[PDB]
Structure 1
């Protein structure tokens, strides 16, 4: 049966970008093959040069977004090069059985493995590393991403009418717990293992030191702001593998939102802010109507503006005065 199915190999791209795919399936079920290489590496996460030992899927935080269609088979080749120091694995919330695949994918440095699973449920799901005994440590070190399982006939609104996006971006939100000395300065370590004991004590406080989008404070700002034009329909996939978040587009809305990200449910309309539970991926669809800069944020404003959970959208086009206008510009009373 599977033997007889067609197979296509897909090369992943770095977040916030997403690999090429079809919204409405043009072929029947296929075996979609992906390859990911584990990369343990130092990463500076803020302006002051705070550095951590990140554990990544394909060298990025978050790992890349995989896109398949309902009932396709996902075949993943997972490589943990001998240059790494730790055992890793992968658990797909999209899969059924063996702890999401975690129990079948344990690879020590120098090993690899190939897992195949059927994508039976449509929606956006989280995938993350989950080694027995050190699950939270690998997850909060950036070892998580997401997979989107699109219905074979694309997205639909509450009335069952088609929703087609022109652009799609993937925003992975990460809570970090950097160990601190007595005065409050962040510690630095030589290897991941040296950090272990302190990492556990930092996590138990339940208070992140940094909460960032795309691995660093300001990663999606300035020259890295997301782009769009007035009239474009944009799908924004957002995931949080460990902690709740409440996304919000400042100056816009979520026209159609699947906060818990499962496509068989009708979306919520006209959201100002929505809650994505830790351990979940959600998706929001919006059509831009005004040009300018928009701030995309986690709406606990301390987490957004003090801790790092803030990004930008720069949109081009003509301003619509009917929607909004400054009647009297700021001036002395």
Structure 2
């Protein structure tokens, strides 16, 4: 019942990085609980979301869609300084699904242009969680404008398999999947707007159709392909955190599997094994662990193939290494 003295906890500052990459961290905690300090600056900005040059007024956390992945360990405290520069035009806030109370922090972080605030919450549950803006009355508009990301709360002793044995990854990637509803004019062409506010009415209309115009990884069609394809080597253990703050998705690694998967992303639950495809409910973050055994190109996709190959929810993995004819081979 007595208060816990948090001033005694050591503090560590984190420098966030743009997705799909993840800031420096340790899987197995090397210290006891800490107050981990993060700072994110909200940025309203125009963003090209497809190959035809379609542009929208994106609402971002730190300039990217999705926002950066934050990483802490179970029972650490997350302290976020949220800044809303006066160059922005809208009210924003933040809802951490990893947090307990005040609408995930949303009721304590409402900031208008020119204001800032610092939120602190205890990361009491291990897993990957979604975080997103949630201004009362305009929630889906902000979220579907790209204002969402994720946070991973690692067990202090790292990841474990269904038998309680260590699962250690060599690389980690964060794939934020985004459903966009770009308004179209009477002619069927995407509309343009001077300011975010000007598009509200049309945006609401576009959203209520429940039919996305685009569904992409890392903010745009092909964002995770070509020179920006994810990479790995045969033998490498890779963890892919995947989030969707507003709509269901079903990740799948073409040519591979999800050896160990936490579809709804909570680590106190044993992972599902050998998944071909897994369902991540809208408003959830999930994580899949895989060890590559074949070199070459792999397609990482939302397995509703239309959403993947037509709407944009598809990325690539370029894997190096020696081919395994035992696992698979063309018979002459």
- TM-score under structure 2 length normalisation: 0.98
Q: CA deviation at 1:183?
A: 2.5
Unaligned runs of 5+ in 1: 329-333
Offset from partner CA, 1:132-152 (integer Å, 9 cap, x none): 100000000000000000000
Equivalent of 2:263 in 239, 259, 265: 259
Query: Are 2:146 and 1:142 equivalent residues in the alignment?
Result: yes
Offset from partner CA, 1:161-181 (integer Å, 9 cap, x none): 000000000000000000011
* Structure 1 runs, 4 residues or longer, greater than 2 Å off: none
Q: Give the distance between the partners of 2:52 and 2:291, measured in 1 at CA.
A: 37
Q: CA deviation at 1:71?
A: 0.4
Offset from partner CA, 1:91-126 (integer Å, 9 cap, x none): 000000000000000000000000100000000000
Q: CA deviation at 1:325?
A: 0.6
Unaligned runs of 5+ in 2: none
RMSD, aligned α-carbons: 0.4
Q: Give the distance between the partners of 2:121 and 2:72, measured in 1 at CA.
A: 12
Mapping of residues 106-121 of structure 1, within 5 Å? 106-121=110-125
Offset from partner CA, 1:50-77 (integer Å, 9 cap, x none): 0000000000000000000000000000
Q: Give the distance between the partners of 1:201 and 1:170, measured in 2 at CA.
A: 31
Q: Give the distance between the partners of 1:288 and 1:48, measured in 2 at CA.
A: 34
Offset from partner CA, 1:214-238 (integer Å, 9 cap, x none): 0000000000000000000000000
Q: CA deviation at 1:182?
A: 1.9
Q: CA deviation at 1:196?
A: 0.7
Between the two proteins, the alignment pairs up a number of residues equal to 328
Instruction: Name the structure 2 match of 1:157.
Output: 161
Offset from partner CA, 1:184-217 (integer Å, 9 cap, x none): 1111111001111100000000000000000000
SS in 1 for 2:103: helix
Q: CA deviation at 1:261?
A: 0.1
Mapping of residues 192-271 of structure 1, within 5 Å? 192-271=196-275
SS in 1 for 2:105: helix
Equivalent of 1:54 in 55, 58, 68: 58
